[PDB]
Design a protein around this nucleic acid. Structure first.
Ligand SMILES: [Mg+2]
Ligand SMILES: [Mg+2]
Ligand SMILES: [Mg+2]
Ligand SMILES: [Mg+2]
Lengths: 145, 56, 102, 112, 116
RNA sequence: GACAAUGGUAGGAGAGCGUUCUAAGGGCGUUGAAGCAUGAUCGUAAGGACAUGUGGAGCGCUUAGAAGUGAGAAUGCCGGU
RNA sequence: UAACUUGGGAGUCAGAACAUGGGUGAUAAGGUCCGUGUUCGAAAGGGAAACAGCCCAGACCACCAGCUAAGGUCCCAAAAU
RNA sequence: CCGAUAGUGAACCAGUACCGUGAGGGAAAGGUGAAAAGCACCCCGGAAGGGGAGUGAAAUAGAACCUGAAACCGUGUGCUUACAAGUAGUCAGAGCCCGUUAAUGGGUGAUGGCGUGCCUUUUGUAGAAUGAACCGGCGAGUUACGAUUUGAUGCAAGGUUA
């Protein structure tokens, strides 16, 4: 073993960003975002800890889908009782609890680890154009699209 | 019927976080100068539940 | 201001006063080895360069020339009758730095 | 200072005694006398004897007083194991373990 | 002359068990189980050395690309820039440079970007 | 100093470690043997020294010889838990 | 750079898959029976999500060095949105 | 040649206890110290047992008495643990603590990567095929005679003894 910089809870910095969701598609977004939250795109990356950033996401509802998968992209959970399958909703979930949609769409691009589930809590989505979290002096951010 | 596996030294102990027994009620005597248990008799000297009403 | 050097088949970062380990050179204690291959020196007067930046020489002292921690090797295939075991130490040479590039 | 007392080959298992001890460890003497002296079990007579015996030897030999005397540590360890056997059906047997114990109390005052 | 085989067995078994310090439950006291768990350990080392080399090559590359996304120089444009420049170093030095000092890295990318 | 080889069961060939005893030589031992326990030590391995505690009388080392010479598994025997 | 004889010592005689020329079978079988070749068996590692045989490739040991093979480059998961 | 699971089965009150109607089969169990000097006396306690005092170099040698390991059980304590999917380790590694047969130190380990036990038998087994509850001990290519080859050694057209 030899020299190389590692990163601790105290050698750290974390930030809070804004991202416009409107006029944008779901794949590109979730990929780039969890390429932030994962701690990647920082030269202090050390994966036995969390250099996970924070992100704010605004106006989820105006996100859009190409082709069908407006409606023919079904989401499935199971209620752990027998015959308790639920196709109960589809891409219309954009209509109702759209924040839930994104927040699951990103938390599948992350692992199931204890860390990975800690990162996903550092996301805050808002289908409405307001947020309470302006206390953090948050920034805007420009995606590459 | 039977166990298939050996019950290790941990689970045998965690299982025993409830075979403890409770600190019994206690209080000093009113004029027998010692401890006994509540809503009961002293067993001494002359019996004192409110004072003597017995011998034993 | 640091510089980057070559040794063995690998490289090191050094600030002056720093210590190093490296695989053996077979040059006794106090016999100050002097490297001849250098690849970068930055900081103020930054000089990245061609391989073997010329005019570049390091000096350092040979504090100790010792041996390593006896790691075990061991290995086997399973359900068969085979195995192996053989330790392996390592030689090394322990230097610290005076006079970053001459 | 320190002080102790022992009982050996007592004809009780460790565990049944060990519970009773876990009602003791840490207290002051007077209380623990009471605690033992009330609970309706088979170990309470014994531990009561051994405790007060320990206070006896502490008093006579070492010349202490009784206020500050506390139970620093107490524990019972396993003893010889008088194997017996109870018959059982179908021509067989089953070896009971009539167990024993070695009780250990160490009264202490904490000072000099 | 019969041979009491004692006086060695225990000693061997201590030389095993005392390589079981920190193992769980009855794996750190009993010979058998600690024998076989040890053998797993040594094998695991024999793949883990290889594995650490793979790992840290990944890590260094990750950090480096995290640097050169700043000038939007994806990692591959860069390296090809470096072989053309007639210079070359390891990884891990691009890492330590681009971590502890930024400017030096910038001057590297200038020296390489201009060979494309 | 170069050059090349060095995965491996059945299995074939080779060099090796330690135990008990013997013969010879040379040595240790109440100013504490052996064994035991602890330890962050040496050797490529099997293994061996060293320091300390307990222990209360015999033991090592070099050369060679003979062996009841090594145990994780027998629905194995015994004993203890 | 191997081939042959002699002499000493054995092990093996239940093989499987993939491709391939064929018989049988239903141009069925992870089928069976033969030839042909490979790998596994006796060989780990990278890819095939996961895997004995398919694909790349044959570990003497250690390194926080590098270049490539099959296969891959949005996140998971390193690498071209 | 053995030195208490060996050797007579039997080192000791053994062909005993025991089992069986009976023929018959068959156990386990050595060690205080140099000397019994084998704990006067006080104290708690019903006793047993113990703490003290003394005998003795040593009683953590005190009669279930040399040495006293491992399993197993506890008492306390440095570190750590209550959103967590674990053949249980290894690699990397922060934090907290400590200081060695004094050297690339040691104890713990938040978190991540990686990873389906051991033998046997098998075309192939994580294997839901088998065996092992743990640990201690015991325990399996031996010996004579002879043939054959290999190596050594002495003699040599001679060699060798029963
Ligand atoms: Mg066994
Ligand atoms: Mg014995
Ligand atoms: Mg075997
Ligand atoms: Mg079969």
């Amino acid at each position: 073993m030899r020299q190389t910089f590692m990163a601790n809870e105290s050698n750290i910095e974390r930030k809070w960003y804004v991202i416009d969701a409107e006029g944008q598609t779901l794949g590109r977004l979730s990929s780039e975002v969890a390429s932030i939250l994962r701690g990647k795109n920082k030269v202090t990356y050390t994966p036995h800890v969390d250099t996970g950033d924070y992100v704010i996401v605004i106006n989820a509802s105006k996100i859009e889908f190409t082709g069908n998968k407006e409606t023919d992209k079904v989401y499935y959970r199971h209620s752990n009782h027998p015959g308790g399958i639920k196709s109960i909703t589809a891409g219309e979930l954009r209509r109702t609890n759209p924040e839930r949609l994104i927040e699951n769409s990103i938390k599948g691009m992350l692992p199931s680890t204890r860390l990975g589930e800690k990162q996903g809590k550092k996301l805050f989505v808002y289908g409405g154009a307001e947020h309470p979290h302006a206390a953090q002096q948050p920034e805007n951010y420009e995606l590459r699209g | 019927a039977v166990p298939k596996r050996r019950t290790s030294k941990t689970r045998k102990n965690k299982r025993r976080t409830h075979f403890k027994i409770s600190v019994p009620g206690m209080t000093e005597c009113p004029n027998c100068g010692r401890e006994y248990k509540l809503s009961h008799r002293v067993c001494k000297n002359c019996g004192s539940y409110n004072g003597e009403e017995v011998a034993a | 201001m640091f510089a980057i050097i070559e040794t063995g088949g690998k490289q090191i970062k050094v600030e002056e006063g720093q210590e190093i380990f490296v695989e053996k050179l077979d040059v006794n204690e106090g016999d100050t080895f002097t490297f001849d291959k250098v690849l970068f020196v930055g900081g103020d007067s930054v000089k990245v360069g061609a391989p073997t930046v010329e005019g570049a020489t390091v000096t350092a002292t040979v504090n100790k020339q010792g041996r390593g921690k006896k790691i075990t090797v061991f290995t086997y295939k399973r359900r068969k009758n085979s195995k192996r075991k053989k330790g392996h130490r390592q030689p090394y040479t322990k230097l610290t730095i005076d006079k970053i590039n001459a | 200072m320190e002080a102790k007392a022992v009982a050996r080959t007592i004809r009780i298992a460790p565990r049944k005694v060990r519970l009773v001890l876990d009602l003791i460890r840490g207290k002051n003497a007077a209380e623990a006398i009471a605690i033992l002296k009330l609970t309706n079990k088979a170990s309470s007579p014994v531990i009561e004897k051994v405790l007060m015996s320990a206070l006896a030897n502490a008093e006579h030999n070492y010349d202490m007083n009784t206020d500050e005397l506390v139970v620093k540590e107490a524990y019972a360890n396993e003893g010889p194991t008088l194997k017996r056997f109870r018959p059982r059906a179908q021509g067989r047997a089953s070896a009971i373990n009539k167990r024993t114990s070695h009780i250990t109390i160490v009264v202490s005052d904490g000072k000099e | 002359p019969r041979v009491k085989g004692g006086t060695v067995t225990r000693a061997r078994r201590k030389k095993t068990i005392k390589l079981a310090k920190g193992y769980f439950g009855s794996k750190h006291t009993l010979y058998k189980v600690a024998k076989q768990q040890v053998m797993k350990s040594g094998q695991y080392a024999f793949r883990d050395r290889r594995q650490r080399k793979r790992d840290f090559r990944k890590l260094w590359i990750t950090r480096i690309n995290a640097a050169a996304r700043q000038h939007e120089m994806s990692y591959s444009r860069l390296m090809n820039g470096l072989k053309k420049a007639g210079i070359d170093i390891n990884r891990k030095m691009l890492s330590e440079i681009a971590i502890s000092d930024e400017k030096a890295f910038a001057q590297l990318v200038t020296k390489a970007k201009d060979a494309l």
